[PDB]
Motif scaffolding. Sequence first.
Motif, PDB file in Angstrom:
ATOM      1  N   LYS A  43      11.590   0.339 -40.054  1.00 38.46           N
ATOM      2  CA  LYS A  43      13.030   0.137 -40.661  1.00 38.46           C
ATOM      3  C   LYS A  43      13.109  -1.120 -41.326  1.00 38.46           C
ATOM      4  N   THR A  45      14.671  -3.671 -44.075  1.00 44.20           N
ATOM      5  CA  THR A  45      16.042  -4.231 -44.416  1.00 44.20           C
ATOM      6  C   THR A  45      15.723  -5.060 -45.444  1.00 44.20           C
TER       7      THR A  45
ATOM      8  N   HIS B  17      19.635 -12.016 -39.720  1.00 44.96           N
ATOM      9  CA  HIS B  17      19.163 -11.630 -41.116  1.00 44.96           C
ATOM     10  C   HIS B  17      19.573 -12.818 -42.068  1.00 44.96           C
ATOM     11  N   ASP B  18      20.879 -13.304 -42.030  1.00 39.03           N
ATOM     12  CA  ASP B  18      21.479 -14.443 -42.760  1.00 39.03           C
ATOM     13  C   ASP B  18      20.557 -15.830 -42.412  1.00 39.03           C
ATOM     14  N   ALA B  20      17.462 -15.784 -41.253  1.00 42.43           N
ATOM     15  CA  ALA B  20      16.008 -15.474 -41.907  1.00 42.43           C
ATOM     16  C   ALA B  20      16.036 -15.929 -43.283  1.00 42.43           C
ATOM     17  N   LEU B  21      17.209 -15.446 -44.168  1.00 41.25           N
ATOM     18  CA  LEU B  21      17.132 -15.710 -45.558  1.00 41.25           C
ATOM     19  C   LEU B  21      17.234 -17.129 -45.726  1.00 41.25           C
ATOM     20  N   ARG B  39      12.271 -12.016 -52.765  1.00 41.96           N
ATOM     21  CA  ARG B  39      12.615 -10.961 -52.073  1.00 41.96           C
ATOM     22  C   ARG B  39      12.382 -11.554 -50.462  1.00 41.96           C
ATOM     23  N   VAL B  40      13.034 -11.032 -49.712  1.00 48.62           N
ATOM     24  CA  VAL B  40      13.051 -11.136 -48.073  1.00 48.62           C
ATOM     25  C   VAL B  40      13.396  -9.820 -47.654  1.00 48.62           C
ATOM     26  N   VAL B  41      12.212  -9.277 -46.866  1.00 45.77           N
ATOM     27  CA  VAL B  41      12.468  -8.234 -46.091  1.00 45.77           C
ATOM     28  C   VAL B  41      12.179  -8.063 -44.519  1.00 45.77           C
ATOM     29  N   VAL B  42      13.022  -7.560 -43.887  1.00 42.70           N
ATOM     30  CA  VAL B  42      12.966  -7.433 -42.194  1.00 42.70           C
ATOM     31  C   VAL B  42      12.418  -6.125 -42.062  1.00 42.70           C
ATOM     32  N   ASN B  43      11.410  -5.871 -41.665  1.00 45.51           N
ATOM     33  CA  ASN B  43      10.747  -4.721 -40.938  1.00 45.51           C
ATOM     34  C   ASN B  43      10.803  -4.576 -39.265  1.00 45.51           C
ATOM     35  N   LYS B  44      11.275  -3.546 -38.814  1.00 43.14           N
ATOM     36  CA  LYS B  44      11.369  -3.070 -37.211  1.00 43.14           C
ATOM     37  C   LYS B  44      10.127  -2.240 -37.414  1.00 43.14           C
ATOM     38  N   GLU B  45       9.001  -2.851 -37.134  1.00 43.82           N
ATOM     39  CA  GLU B  45       7.586  -1.620 -37.330  1.00 43.82           C
ATOM     40  C   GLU B  45       7.372  -1.062 -35.972  1.00 43.82           C
ATOM     41  N   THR B  46       7.315   0.236 -35.948  1.00 43.21           N
ATOM     42  CA  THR B  46       6.924   0.791 -34.757  1.00 43.21           C
ATOM     43  C   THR B  46       5.639   1.832 -34.986  1.00 43.21           C
ATOM     44  N   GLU B  47       4.754   1.088 -34.167  1.00 47.58           N
ATOM     45  CA  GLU B  47       3.104   1.931 -34.168  1.00 47.58           C
ATOM     46  C   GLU B  47       3.288   3.110 -33.250  1.00 47.58           C
ATOM     47  N   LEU B  48       3.273   4.192 -34.018  1.00 47.73           N
ATOM     48  CA  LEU B  48       3.339   5.534 -33.029  1.00 47.73           C
ATOM     49  C   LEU B  48       1.981   5.602 -32.158  1.00 47.73           C
ATOM     50  N   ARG B  57       6.875  -4.453 -33.533  1.00 48.18           N
ATOM     51  CA  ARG B  57       6.853  -5.773 -34.053  1.00 48.18           C
ATOM     52  C   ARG B  57       8.044  -5.889 -34.799  1.00 48.18           C
TER      53      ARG B  57
END
Lengths: 70, 71
Positions: A43, A45, B17-18, B20-21, B39-48, B57
């Motif tokens: 996900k 963002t 988010h704010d 983090a930036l 660039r600043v990206v937040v990832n909700k990473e789900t390993e299946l 993570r």
Amino acid sequence: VIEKRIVIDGDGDIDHDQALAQAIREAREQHPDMSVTRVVVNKETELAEEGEDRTRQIINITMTKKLDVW
Amino acid sequence: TVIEKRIVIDGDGDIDHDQALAQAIREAREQHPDMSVTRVVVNKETELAEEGEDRTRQIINITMTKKLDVW
């Protein structure tokens, strides 16, 4: 190794189990000599200081060569 | 020169988010004054996982390139 990246624009929830099932199925079908070794859903963002935080869904499927038993 | 700073949080606690930036920009100004965060990206990473619970993570990826500023 093969990295298959699939982008879905929009923060709509993704069925994880069906994503994994579909990954393995399409792999068996289209790449029979390889086996899926990783499936991750992100996900993502992108933070913007000047406006709206865009959200995408990134499905990354890592597939390597099939490893015969002997 | 491009810098990719990757930060992993194993706990799935929600991320400001704010903030983090803000922290990205602050640490960039501090340690890399000649560079600017682009660039600043937040990832909700789900390993299946087929055999159990999917570990999740949170990955903060900060892309910073050379400053684009005349004079």
